[PDB]
Amino acid sequence: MKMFIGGLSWQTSPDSLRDYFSKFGEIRECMVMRDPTTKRSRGFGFVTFADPASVDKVLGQPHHELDSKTIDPKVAFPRRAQPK
Amino acid sequence: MKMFIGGLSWQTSPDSLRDYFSKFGEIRECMVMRDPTTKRSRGFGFVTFADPASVDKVLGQPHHELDSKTIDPKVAFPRRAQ
Structure with missing residues (x-):
């Protein structure tokens, strides 16, 4: 159970994104990538918390911002394929 | 390094995404998730190939279609925090 953050x-x-979200609880993984869908320079990120309670705290807080962008964290539930 | 596929x-x-991209090369990992940025239903996908050469073959093909949707795979380079 990850959080997806678009529009970074x-x-x-990734350290900046980690530092922001660590205020809500222990982070197991935090990754950023440049968003390849636009030439406008922006990123998206995924944050994985150790405790699902942290996701509720993020979703409950009505305003999030980071590096001059208003961000809107969403939940994401990746489904992996088996080997062929 | 992964390929990002929006608008699924x-x-x-996941198995259909895997089976489509396996035509271009060996797969290390393949995942699908609901795109949480729209109220309607669409997905995005991430495909990790064993060999970057497979990415070139995907990028070089002019038209891609999966489950009747045009898809336009892009390259992505995830960076993890310390």
């Missing part, structure tokens, strides 16, 4: 500033590093 | 049909399963 190009200046947002 | 809601019907596209």
Whole structure:
């Protein structure tokens, strides 16, 4: 159970994203990538918390911002394929 | 390094995404999730190939279609926090 964060500033590093979301609980993994769907320089990120309670705290807080962008964290539930 | 596929049909399963891209090369990992940025139903996908050469073959093909949707795979380079 991950959180997906779209619309990140190009200046947002994975450490920056980690630092923001660690205020809500223990982070198991935090990754950013440049969003390849636009030439506008922006990123998206995925945050994995150790405790699902942390997701509720994020979703409950009505305003989030990071590196001059208003962000809107969403839940994401990846489904992996088996080997062929 | 992964390929990002936006705009998947809601019907596209992980296995279908895997079977489509396996035509271009060996797969390390393949996942699908609901795109949480729309109220209607669509997916996005992430495919990790064993060999980057497979990415070139995907990028070079002019038209891709999966479960009746045009898809336009892009390259992505995830960076993890320390």
